[PDB]
C-alpha cells in the first residue's frame, strides 16, 4: 500500500492521473520524482522548469555542480540527484527531443531507467515541449517499465484522450 490517490489503473504496474506533478510531489513526497531533463540539466521550461521553480532554483544549483563534475548526460540516460522539497530523490531522465531531431527509438532506453526504482512519480517522457506523441510515450512506458509508475498528466484534455485511446 502506498499514498498515491485518485489514480486510474492502466496495467498491473502503471497508473495515471490528471495532476500537476509539482503539486503531486509536494503532497506525496515520493521516494522518486522523475524530471523531464535535457543532457545539460538546464531546467528552463516544461516539467523541468516547473520542478526547478518549486525548489527555488536549488535543483538548478545542484545540477550545475553535477554537470561541471561529470559532463552532460546521454540522450536516453539519467542521473539520481536530490529531490529537494519535492521528493527524497529526483531521477533526471533524458528522453529524445523531437524538436532537436533526436531518435524516437531512444524513448525506450529512457524509460528503462525507471526499472532501477521500485516506485516513481513521473511525467510522460518526451511529451510536452519535447515534441513526441504522448499516446506513443504512454505505450512505450507500459511496454518498458516493470516497476510501479504513477504518471501525472498536467493537461486534462490530453489525460482524457490518453485514457480513452488506451489499449
Ligand atoms: C506551477 N506548476 C507547474 O508549472 N507545473 C507544470 C508545468 C509544466 C508541465 C509540463 O510541461 N508537462 C509536460 C512535459 C514537459 C516536458 C516533457 C514532457 C512533458 C509531459 C508533461 C505533460 O504534458 O503532462 C507540467 C507541470
UniProtKB/Swiss-Prot annotation:
Species annotation: Severe acute respiratory syndrome coronavirus 2 (2019-nCoV)
Residues covered by the Macro domain: 1-167
Protein name in UniProt: Papain-like protease nsp3
Role this protein plays: Responsible for the cleavages located at the N-terminus of the replicase polyprotein. Participates together with nsp4 in the assembly of virally-induced cytoplasmic double-membrane vesicles necessary for viral replication. Antagonizes innate immune induction of type I interferon by blocking the phosphorylation, dimerization and subsequent nuclear translocation of host IRF3. Also prevents host NF-kappa-B signaling. In addition, PL-PRO possesses a deubiquitinating/deISGylating activity and processes both 'Lys-48'- and 'Lys-63'-linked polyubiquitin chains from cellular substrates.
Mutagenesis / variant outcome for changing residue 164 to L: In strain: Gamma/P.1
Lineage of producing organism: Viruses, Riboviria, Orthornavirae, Pisuviricota, Pisoniviricetes
Activity control, per UniProt: Inhibited in vitro by GRL-0617.
Localization in the cell: Host endoplasmic reticulum membrane
Name of the gene: rep
Record's subunit section: May form homohexamers. Interacts with N protein.
Membrane topology summary: Multi-pass membrane protein
Phenotype when changing residue 31 to A: In strain: Mu/B.1.621
Reaction catalyzed: Thiol-dependent hydrolysis of ester, thioester, amide, peptide and isopeptide bonds formed by the C-terminal Gly of ubiquitin (a 76-residue protein attached to proteins as an intracellular targeting signal)
